[PDB]
Amino acid sequence: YDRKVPSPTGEYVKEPEWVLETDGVNLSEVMTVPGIDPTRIYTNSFIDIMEVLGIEAGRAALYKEVYNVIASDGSYVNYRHMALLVDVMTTQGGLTSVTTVEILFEAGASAELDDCRGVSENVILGQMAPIGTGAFDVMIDEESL
Amino acid sequence: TTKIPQIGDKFASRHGQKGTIGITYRREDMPFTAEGIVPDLIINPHAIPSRMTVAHLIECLLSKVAALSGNEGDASPFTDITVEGISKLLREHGYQSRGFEVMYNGHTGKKLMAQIFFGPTYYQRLRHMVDDKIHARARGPGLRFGEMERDCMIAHGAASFLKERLMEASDAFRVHICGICGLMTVIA
Amino acid sequence: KAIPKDQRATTPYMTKYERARILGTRALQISMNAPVFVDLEGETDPLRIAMKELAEKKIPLVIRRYLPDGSFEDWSVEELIVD
Amino acid sequence: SNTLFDDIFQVSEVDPGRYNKVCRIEAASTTQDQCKLTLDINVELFPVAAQDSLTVTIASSLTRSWRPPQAGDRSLADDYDYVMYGTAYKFEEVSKDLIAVYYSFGGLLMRLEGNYRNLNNLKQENAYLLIRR
Amino acid sequence: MNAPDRFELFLLGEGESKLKIDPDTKAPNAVVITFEKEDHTLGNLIRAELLNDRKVLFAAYKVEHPFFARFKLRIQTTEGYDPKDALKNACNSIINKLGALKTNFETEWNLQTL
Amino acid sequence: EEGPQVKIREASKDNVDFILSNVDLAMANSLRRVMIAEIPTLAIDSVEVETNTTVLADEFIAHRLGLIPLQSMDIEQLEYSRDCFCEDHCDKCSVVLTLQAFGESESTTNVYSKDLVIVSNLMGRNIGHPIIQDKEGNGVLICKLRKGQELKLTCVAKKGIAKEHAKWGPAAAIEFEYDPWNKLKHTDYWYEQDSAKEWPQSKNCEYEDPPNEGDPFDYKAQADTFYMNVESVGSIPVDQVVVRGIDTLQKKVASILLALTQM
Amino acid sequence: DVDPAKRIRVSHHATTFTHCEIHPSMILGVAASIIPFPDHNQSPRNTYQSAMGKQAMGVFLTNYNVRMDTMANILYYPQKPLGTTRAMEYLKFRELPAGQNAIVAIACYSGYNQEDSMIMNQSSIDRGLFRSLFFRSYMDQEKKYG
Amino acid sequence: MIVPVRCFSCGKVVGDKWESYLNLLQEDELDEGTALSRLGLKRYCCRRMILTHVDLIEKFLRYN
Amino acid sequence: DFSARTVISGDPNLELDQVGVPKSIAKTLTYPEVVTPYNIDRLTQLVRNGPNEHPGAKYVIRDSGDRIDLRYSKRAGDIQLQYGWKVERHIMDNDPVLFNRQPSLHKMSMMAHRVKVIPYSTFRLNLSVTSPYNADFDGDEMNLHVPQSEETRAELSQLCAVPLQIVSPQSNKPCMGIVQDTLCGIRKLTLRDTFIELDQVLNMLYWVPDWDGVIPTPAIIKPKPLWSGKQILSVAIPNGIHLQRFDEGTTLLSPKDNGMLIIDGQIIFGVVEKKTVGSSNGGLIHVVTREKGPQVCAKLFGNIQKVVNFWLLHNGFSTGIGDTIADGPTMREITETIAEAKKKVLDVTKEAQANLLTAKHGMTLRESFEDNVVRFLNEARDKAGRLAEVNLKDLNNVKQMVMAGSKGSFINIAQMSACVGQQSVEGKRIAFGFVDRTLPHFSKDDYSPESKGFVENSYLRGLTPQEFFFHAMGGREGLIDTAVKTAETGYIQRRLVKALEDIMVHYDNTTRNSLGNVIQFIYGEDGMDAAHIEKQSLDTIGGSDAAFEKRYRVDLLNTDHTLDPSLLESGSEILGDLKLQVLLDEEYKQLVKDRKFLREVFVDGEANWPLPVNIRRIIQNAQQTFHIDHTKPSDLTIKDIVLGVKDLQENLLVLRGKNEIIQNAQRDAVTLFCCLLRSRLATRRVLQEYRLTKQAFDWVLSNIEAQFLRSVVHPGEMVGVLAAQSIGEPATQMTLKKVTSGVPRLKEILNVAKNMKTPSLTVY
Amino acid sequence: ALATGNWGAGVSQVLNRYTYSSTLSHLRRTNTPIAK
Ligand SMILES: [Mn+2]
Ligand SMILES: [Mn+2]
Ligand SMILES: [Zn+2]
Ligand SMILES: [Zn+2]
């Protein structure tokens, strides 16, 4: 592979490096093998990244897996979509996937507190949902001339 | 009932591309050939190169010669028929041989800078038409607003519409409520 | 549980959302023959009229912004910057 | 109210590349080792051949509609064959310690390398250009 | 159906007129006339004669949607010279040249066997 | 007789090829247009059916009816039905035709337009008659019947313009050309190797002098001379499609002056 | 010395044939046997035509007027195709066709044939082009198990 | 179902030319194009008309 | 409920934001409008005309909640309406209504349009809204929805209207551009040689509805007055709009007419094609949106299409079987190109047949052989097709479309004119479905091109039987794969949207779930709205160390390295000033840091990265707006610049909290924008490159500041859905290496799967 | 079982009569219920 790297006089150049690529994955162990750079090792298994290097690093992998897919088809989506997703998938600290009366009974017994900010719940209740134009209240300005 | 073609109806050649009629023009307004021949249909060139439907194009050359010559034109697959041949034949018969012709704009009569591929092609009227397909239900006494449509409007942020739209007509009953026990237990 | 007019920390500009709801609220009222505050230099259309109102800053309403913890800040239309 | 460059040129070359009605003269000046012209010409309305030569003046009148010939029947601030009307977009290539000014006629382009008329070529559009054979 | 009957292409609805004439704000000595139940036949014809007239500064026409038969012609003329006058002066020419031509025709046709 | 000049070159009952010469394209084209679209003509445009045990349907029949061309030389003398103060139709706005046919023969019985009878007073204005142009004097084949089948109808013709429906149009194709050399460079010819080997020469080139390879392009020329050919279908004779067509524009134009006068 | 415009075919490197095809066009079925030049078309398209054909209007039997079915479409004026295949023979398509040969122009003219749409000639329509008959039959039963 | 009355595209009447067309080919032994040109159908639009008609009525007439 | 659905058609004569509604539909759908003294006379007239004449009405409702039915109602003709009654009127021109093409996979599949009532029966649309809706005119139908109160009408127009959705957040560029014809033709119209005469000119000009009446002055006066195409399109592009672009060796004399250069609303140089006018990051529609606002932008699409399409309607364009024929000579070259490849194959054949070929490393021998013969064959296909491309002429219409960008590509030339190429099924050459052979017409053990699915012929030429069948094999595999994509993609998309649906931005700028949890402590790490973000080059990043010190270093104590005094009035007086030099060194230290920082952030060296506030373009405009002479020293001082840009930073606010924590956030959020900033308004630059005056400069800054503020995201916005739609919608046009890719992969990611299909370690 | 398609079911259907060749096509169909 080609690697752009800065040069002695400051500009970026190409500098090839050999790389190895595997079928199959043993990151904990391969990382340790003498002669490789352990700081740059990669895998497309973002689970193993998280297991070895932690939730952050897996979040960064996962992003990079999703971005791969989306640029492999040749299209482009703003950072501000895929990061959100990826945060959603990693804010409990692990990688969480994103993929009636009966239920009410359980609420009951659980004492579920419904925050009321969804749009269905609000429908039910005859209300706007606190989204968008519903996220603030409007009142009459008794303080004006 | 008789159905006369109209804006809306669908048509196809036999090369796996359809279209609806987008407007009609009477013949004065169409573009025309020195001979005075005018098209019965006008299709857009942007429909061609991606679909790589060169058989359309070849059928229309082949069909010109047929009609000029009164022979059936043999369009079966796997023969010796070739465009070069066909274009030969059509030059013998006095037209440019890849099927272009000069034509003249209708509205003004001036010639067209560009010439135009012009020929018969067999087109089919397909079933199923703007009249059967239009409906329009808004009461007195697809076509829906489903999960995904909701989602686009939450996207845009449109809460009031989302409440209007998804309500009941089911009247707003009013109710007293304890503010310690939230229940509707209250004696009013 | 309210936040004092100094020390407010949320934007001073009007949001698209606020604006859309203001215009719409006011147009509803204008639509129902509610008095108007601004010169109708001809206008007959409620939204339009509303927008004239908002441009002349004569919409006496206030926007209450909740924060995610229950707390809120009150910003008046008069004051919100409109871009 | 004026004129502001004007000279005579020697045509090195004429490329039509790829277009049919338009071609690009490379012309030299007869005079100055220095001042050149590269320039786009409608060769249908004004043909042009290698080594022919040219009396070229930019100039700056004789922004209101346009009105037909009529003014045009005596009033010709032109005793030329060929006149365009353009706009300068300049880059003052301020190159070496000679100038280039750039000019676009509906997209037919020009460019003058030189010097002596720094304090001469409008910063500005209103720029006409005129040719006799 | 939803189709407007075909007579609408040549025949005026209640309250419509053949012309409406209105002054153009953008420029002086200009007007825009909209011609109803008319199309290119006329509309290119009047226009192009307006442009043989040297006191014509501008003339143009267009049919804004094909669905309706109407066109709009815009004339601009020199100070002193009413536009509408330029359109009589022009419709007049037309009449005259055709005058002529039905004659030159009718003639060429007896000089004729078969 | 100074102005737009004419020059027929061929003429025949059915076509008239000529050259207009000293006019603008606009009027040339316009005249083409009118000829195609607005010369009034007569045509069946209502049809009541008493009986039809035919193998075709009524509307299918009717529509064929409105296509058969009918005589139209005296059609300025028939008022448009909607201008006539009659309730519905009459003799001043309408020729009425009938058709009855029964398949008497074992063999198959054709129905032609010659089988059409006019049934109303024409005031000896030559209109209404089925136009016939075949050797056998049949005119158009309208239907066919089997032994035992019957069709009876009446029709009403009425004056109308092809704008309104092409049945009413008197012209058929109208050849039109100009500049056959291409001198005006109004068109830009497509080719693979050579534009002049590749495109056919127009008959109209003979009448005009080729250009000479040196000849530098002529900016000022315009379009002055046009090669036409109007073909008539028959309800109006040809010379007439022209004359009436020049005439109809000149009418249009004048209604414009008439309504500047009314402002 | 082969015809430069013919396609390339790669000969018999074969002394052992035991049979020969009757004709290669016979790999096709009934639908694709009506496409002209399918051998000059990308493959999926001939797969769409093979459906659409199934929706075109023609004359489904000479006996329509006597049957009584739920729906039916007949075209006023079927024409046979100027360009046919040899298999149509057997399929009768020229007898009972489902299409008309239209004059067609491939052109940008006015912007109303964009995105897989078409301008059609009104006058052409007046005079018949693509008109068809449409018949629906309603049924109903009497009383029953009361 | 029956010759159409005119060329869809140009208006030429054409529905007075079917008996003859067919007489011109079975009687007088001409090839379909020579026959069409005989009837004065010289644009490819009209030629298409008669050359691709199919007279279905002739079957429909067989039923009782 | 209060909706309609029909077939859609295009219409070049409606605006971008209208939709045409047939009359009949318009008479069916209604809006309830309250009587007031503003409208009682109109409502009266509409009541009179009734239910069946459009503009009319269907019911009247009075005080009482009684409903008066206009069609039946013996008093239908004698209603005297009162203030505060309701009329349910038909909809009418310019009411807002929402239009949607299903499946509605992002929000621009539901936009708000201004009605236009029309005859016949289809809803009509401008061609340039097609693409967001992903609709065409062969059948598609769309649904139209009438809002029922004032508030909802407001919502629709003030947030969902089409014009407000030209630039979208999905990819921080336009999502609507000029297409199909008008793109064919705007290129044509803008070529060097296209000139137009007066007659046409003025008709073009009158066609743009808000032409000032001025006939422009023609670019040829001399033998003849002839205007260029460029000039007359220019009529449509409004004043004040600058755009430049360099293509592969454009220069300001573009020999080729490449690239684009446009200054105060007039085209200087370049042909106009899909780069300029398409839906492109930093093209004209993205420029005009921003510089002039959504409504002017949306007129532009229709002025441009009016103009161009008129031109095109009289110029003409078509395509034919001719445009696929390449030269005899080309064809023999093609045939040889082909022939060669077939000999390469043959040797690799014999070579393997003698056991001499090597594999390399866990790759099998046969795998090695295939991988080569398929290289060979493809390589052939491609040469042959570049062969054909070259050979066609600029008047070749296929070429002409490819060129403008409006339809087609290389592959299509190729296969139509030169060679269709190797077919495959599962990644592989056609396989031996009978025993040891692909069809019974071949003999056993044949691995050659023909026997395993290379189609050598083009479509023009024709496929043989065998080829025909293997291309059908191929084809079918896509038909299937297509369906399975469509399927998969569908369920992903709904799952993403359910997952994210509740995240929203809150007025602390945090993004959160319906619990209040924190997902992001500021949206997008920067607090921006993605609509307001554009690709810009960060300058400090690239370049040699020498070069970055030429461009940014000022040393006033050194005669070679100060600021020439022509740059600047003060320039004599500052030489050797020590105390200016202290600032300036401070400024450079910060530039130097900046470049390190950034090269840590972008380890690669990539300089172009989307950030809010296109400063080049502000500066460009400053340069035009103040008529700036590049031949005068400026009146700026050092301190003006230097302290001026320092000060601006303080004001690019995203967060507003008095404590330190929020202030640190604030700072970190605006770090990258501020690198761009200092680089771009450093002292030598502002003098030596940009030559600003004081005033212009002071204008550049305050603008930067307004624009920056206006790019902050607004509280209330529902990401989450947005994010999900944005990720999903383009995963649906994945209709299409030796790692699992594209849709299945992406299933594999969201599903968090234990057992992935190709797992791999890349080891450096 | 002929009225229903009750067997395997879709086994009997009403014969298409849109167009002639659609009929022939229908009589020459095949179907496969349920690895490639
Ligand atoms: Mn399509
Ligand atoms: Mn579609
Ligand atoms: Zn009467
Ligand atoms: Zn014809």
Q: What domain range includes position I213?
A: 166-318
Which among I441, I460, B61 has a CA at the least distance from the CA of G6?
I460
- Measured in whole angstroms, how far is the alpha carbon of residue G67 from the centre of its chain? 24
Q: Distance between CA F146 and CA F53 in Å, rounded?
A: 10
Cα–Cα dist I385/I410, whole Å: 8
- Residues of I with a Cβ under 8 Å from any F Cβ are 223-224, 322, 325, 327, 395
User: Which residue in the list G1, G3, G116, G126 is annotated as catalytic?
Assistant: G116
Q: Can you tell me the distance from the alpha carbon of B106 to that of G4, in angstroms, rounded to the nearest whole number? A: 40
What CATH code is carried by the domain that includes residue I337? 1.10.132.30
8 Å CB contact of G65 and F55: yes
DSSP for chain F, please give it.
--SSB----EE-SSEEE--EESS-HHHHHHHHHHHHHT--EEEEEEEEEEEE-SSS-HHHHHHHHHHS-B--TTGGGS--TTTS-SSS--SSS--EEEEEEE--SSS-EEEEGGGPEE-S--TT-S---B---STTS---EEEEE-TT-EEEEEEEEEEE-TTT-GGG--EEEEE--B-SS-TT--S----SS-HHHHSPPPGGGTTSPPP-TT----TT----EE--EEEE-SSS-SHHHHHHHHHHHHHHHHHHHHHHHT-
Edge-to-edge strand list for the sheet holding F41-52: F41-52, F150-160, F96-102, F117-118
Overall number of domains in chain E: 1
The DSSP annotation for I324-383 comes to G---HHHHHHHHHHHHHHHHHHHHHHHHHHTT-PPP-SS--HHHHHHHHHHHHHHHHHHH
User: Can you say whether residue I364 is alpha, beta or left, with left for phi > 0 and alpha for psi between -120 and 50 degrees?
Assistant: beta
Phi, psi of F247 (to 5 degrees): -65, -40
What resolution does the deposited structure have, in angstroms?
Answer: 3.4
The beta-carbon neighbor of B67 closest among H10, H35, H51 is: H51
Contact between I445 and I405 under an 8 Å Cβ cutoff? The reply is: no
Residue with tokens 């919502």: I155
CB-neighbour burial class of residue I658 (10 A; exposed 0-12, middle 13-18, buried 19+): exposed
Quick one: tokens of I469? 């069948």
Q: B111 with F178: CB under 8 angstroms?
A: yes
Ligand 1 centroid from CA I140, angstroms: 8
Residue H33: count of CB within 10 angstroms of its CB: 17
The residue ranges of DSSP E strands in chain C, in sequence order, are 61-66, 72-76
The domain segmentation of chain F, as residue ranges, is 1-40+167-263, 41-166
CA–CA distance, D48 with D15 (Å, rounded to integer):
11
Those residues of chain G whose CB sits closer than 8 Å to some CB in chain I are: 4-10, 13-14, 16, 21, 24, 27, 37-44, 47, 105-112, 114-117
- Mutate one of A133, A136, A138 to test the B interface: name it (highest B CB count within 10 A): A133
Is F155 annotated to bind a ligand? Reply is no
* Closest to F102 (Cα-Cα) out of F175, F159, F152: F152
Active site residue G69: no
| Chain G partners within 8 Å of F167 (Cβ) | 126-127
Are the C-beta atoms of residues I29 and B27 closer than 8 Å to each other?
Answer: no
What is the enclosing helix (H) or strand (E) of I400? helix I397-404
Contact by Cβ (8 Å): I764, A37: yes
Torsion on CA atoms C10, C14, C20, C25, rounded to nearest 10: 90
SS3 E60: strand
Q: Give the Cα separation of I450 and I330 in Å (integer).
A: 23
C-alpha span between D12 and D7 (Å, rounded): 16
Nearest Cα residue to H44 out of B71, B43, F196: B71
Q: Which residues contact E92 (CB under 8 A, 6 or more apart)?
A: F257
Determine if residue E64 is left, alpha or beta; phi over 0 gives left, psi from -120 to 50 gives alpha, anything else beta.
Answer: alpha
| Whole-angstrom distance, CA of residue I69 vs CA of residue I80 | 14
The reply to whether F41-166 shares the fold of F1-40+167-263 is no
Neighbours of ion ligand 3 (CB under 5 A): F 84, 86, 90, 92-93
User: B134 vs I497: CB contact, 8 Å cut-off?
Assistant: no
Q: Could you tell me where the DSSP H helices lie in I34-85?
A: 40-49
Distance CA F149, CA E35 (A): 53
Could you give phi then psi for residue I416, rounded to 5 degrees?
-75, -40
Closest to B59 (Cα-Cα) out of I468, G37, G85, G101: G37
Return the structure tokens found at I152: 């909802």
Interface size D-I, in CB pairs within 8 Å, comes to 104
- Per the CB < 8 A criterion, the answer to whether E60 and E24 are in contact is no
Helix axes E83-108, F25-37, angle to 10 degrees: 70
For residue A5, give both structure tokens.
């790297």
Q: How far is the CA of B19 from the centre of ligand 2 (A)?
A: 8
Separation of alpha carbons I719 and I92, rounded Å: 34
Please give the radius of gyration of chain F, using alpha carbons only, rounded to the nearest integer.
Answer: 24
The verdict on whether residue H59 carries a ligand-binding annotation is no
Residue I66 sits in the same domain as residue I103? no
Q: How was this structure determined?
A: X-ray
A14 membership: H or E segment, kind and range: strand A12-16
Look at strands I3-10 and I123-125 and give their pairing.
Answer: parallel
Closest residue of E to F1, CA-based?
E104
Class (C level, CATH) for B5-141: mainly beta
The verdict on I19 and I66 lying in the same domain is: no
Q: Which residues contact I308 (CB under 8 A, 6 or more apart)?
A: I182, I185, I186, I189, I233
First to last CA, chain F: 35
Buried b (16+ CB within 10 A) or exposed e, E30-61: bbbbbbbbbbbbbbbbbbbbbbebebbbbbbb
Q: Cis peptide before I163, with omega less than 30 degrees from 0?
A: no
Can you tell me which residue has the tokens 């000139």?
Answer: I195
Residue I500 near residue A83 (C-beta atoms within 8 A): no
Q: Consult the annotation and say whether F84 binds a ligand.
A: yes
Residue (of I194, I193, I217) closest to I205 by Cα position: I217
For G60, the closest of J17, J25, J28 (CB atoms) is J17
Could you count the other beta carbons within 10 Å of the beta carbon of residue I55? 16
Annotated binding site of G for Mg(2+): 116
**d(Cα G124, Cα H11) in Å, to the nearest integer?**
8
DSSP-derived pairing of the beta strands D127-132 and D108-113: unpaired
Tokens of I373: 């013969």
Q: Which residues, at least 6 apart from E7, have a Cβ–Cβ distance to it below 8 Å? A: F164
Instruction: Clarify whether residues I276 and I415 are in a common domain.
Output: no
Exposed / middle / buried, residue I681 (Cβ in 10 Å: 0-12, 13-18, 19+): buried
For the CA atoms of I262, I265, I268, I271, what is the dihedral angle to 10 degrees?
70
CB B35 within 8 A of CB B94: no
Same-domain pairing of I444 and I576: no
Query: What SS3 state is found at A73?
Result: coil
Q: What is the DSSP string of chain G?
A: ---TTSPP------S------S-GGGGS-TTGGGSSSGGGB-HHHHHHHHHHGGGB-S-S-TTGGG---SEEEEESS-B--SEE-TTHHHHTTTTS---EEEEEEE-B-SSTTTTTEEEEEHHHHHTTTT-EEEEE----------
Q: Phi/psi of residue I597, each to 5°?
A: -45, -45
SS3 for I396? coil
Cβ partners under 8 Å of residue C39, min gap 6: none
Read out DSSP for I698-736?
HHHHHHHHHHHHHTBPPTT--TTHHHHHHHHHHHTT---
Across A32-131, the runs of DSSP E, i.e. the strands, are 42-43
In this structure, what token pair is assigned to residue A137? 């209240």
The residue among I228, F179, F23, F188 whose CA lies nearest residue D45 is I228
- How far F78 CA sits from the closest chain H CA (Å)? 24
- G-I C-beta contacts closer than 8 Å: 110
Backbone breaks in chain G after residues (C–N over 2.5 Å): none
Is the Cβ of D65 closer than 8 Å to some Cβ of chain E? yes
Output the CA angle B61-B63-B65, nearest 5 degrees.
Answer: 75
Q: Is I407 helix (H, G, I), strand (E, B) or coil?
A: coil
CATH class in words for F1-40+167-263 = alpha beta
> Could you identify the residue written with the tokens 């339009």?
C48
Range of the domain at E59: 1-114
G65: amino acid identity, one letter = N
Token pair recorded at residue I737 = 């290496």
With CB atoms and an 8 Å threshold, state whether B4 touches G35. Answer: no
CB contact under 8 A, I416 and B49: yes
Mutate to test the interface with D, among F213, F217, F218 (most CBs of D within 10 A): F217
I339: tokens are 């022939």
Q: How far is CA A42 from the centre of its chain?
A: 18
**I141 CA distance to ligand 2 middle (Å):** 9
* C-alpha triplet F5, F11, F13: angle, nearest 5°: 130
For C15, C29, I80, the CA distances from C78, given in Å and listed in that order, are 14, 18, 40
CATH of C1-83, one of 3.40.50.2300, 3.30.2130.10, 3.90.940.10, 3.90.226.10: 3.90.940.10
Q: Is the CB of residue B126 less than 8 Å from the CB of residue B14?
A: no
Contact, E7 vs F168, CB < 8 A?
Answer: no
Q: G110: phi > 0 → left, psi -120 to 50 → alpha, else beta; which?
A: left
DSSP conformation class of I308 = H
How many interchain CB pairs under 8 A, B with I? 238
CATH number of the domain enclosing E61: 3.30.1360.10
- What the block records as the tokens of I439 is 């069809």
Inter-chain contact D65–E54, Cβ cutoff 8 Å? no
DSSP conformation class of B127: S
| Distance, CA of I235 to CA of I266 (rounded, Å) | 8
Q: Which CATH number fits domain H1-64: 1.10.10.60, 3.40.50.720, 1.10.3470.10, 1.10.1510.10?
A: 1.10.10.60
Q: First and final CA of chain A: distance in angstroms? A: 72
Provide the β-strand partners of residue D54.
D9
Query: Residue I16 in contact with residue I111, Cβ under 8 Å?
Result: no
In this structure, which ligand is nearest to the CA of F84?
Answer: 3
Rounded to 10 deg, the angle between the I638-650 and I694-710 helix axes is 10
Residue F90, classified by CB atoms within 10 Å of its CB into exposed (0-12), middle (13-18) or buried (19+), is middle
Decide if I459 and G116 are in contact by the 8 Å CB cutoff.
no
Give CA–CA dist I54/G128, Å, rounded: 32
φ and ψ at residue I746, rounded to 5 degrees: -70, -35
Is F219 an 8 Å CB contact of chain D? yes
Q: E strand or H helix at I742, and its extent?
A: helix I742-750
Instruction: Please measure the distance between the N-terminal and C-terminal CA atoms of chain E and give it in whole angstroms.
Output: 48
CA distance D89 to F169: 58
Number of neighbours of residue B41 by Cβ within 10 angstroms: 25
How far, in Å, CA of E102 to CA of E108, rounded? 10
Task: Tokens for D20, please give them.
Answer: 């049919």
CA distance I113 to I157: 8
Element (H, E) at B92: helix B83-92
At I295, which amino acid appears?
Answer: Q
Strands (E), chain D: 8-15, 22-29, 36-42, 53-59, 82-86, 100-101, 104-105, 108-113, 127-132
The CATH class that applies to domain F41-166 reads mainly beta
Provide the residue range defining the domain that includes D8: 1-133
Provide CB contacts within 8 A for I131, sequence distance 6+. Answer: I175, I176, I177, I179, I279
Which tokens go with G137?
Answer: 């039959």
Total Cβ atoms within 10 A of residue I647: 11
> How far, in Å, CA of F232 to CA of F72, rounded?
12
* Residue closest to A93 by CA, chosen among A67, A58, A63, A61: A58
Residue F180: left (phi > 0), alpha (psi -120 to 50), or beta? Answer: alpha
Q: Are residues F176 and B114, on separate chains, in Cβ contact within 8 Å?
A: no
Nearest-angstrom CA–CA distance, G119 and I259? 35
> B28, F34 in Cβ contact below 8 A?
no
CA B7–ligand 2 middle distance (angstroms):
16
- Residues I313 and I459: their CA atoms lie apart, in Å, by 31
**Is residue I257 a contact partner of residue I269, using CB atoms and an 8 Å limit?**
yes
Cα G115 to averaged position of ligand 4 atoms, centre (Å)? 29
| Cross-chain Cβ contact D106/I215 below 8 Å | no
Task: Quote the minimal CA–CA distance from D25 to chain F in Å.
Answer: 19
Helix axes A55-72 and I742-750, enclosed angle (nearest 10): 160
Give the gyration radius of chain C's Cα atoms.
14
DSSP letter at I460 equals T
Token look-up 């000149």 returns: F250
Whether I278 and I329 map to the same domain: the answer is no
Identify the bridge partners of residue B24 per DSSP, sorted by sequence position. G120
CB within 8 Å: B83 and I102: no
Q: Rounded to an integer, what distance in angstroms lies between the CA atom of residue D111 and that of residue I253? A: 8
Neighbouring CB atoms inside 10 A of F63's CB total 21
Q: How far apart are CA C81 and CA I295, in angstroms?
A: 21
Cα of B149 to nearest chain A Cα, Å = 13
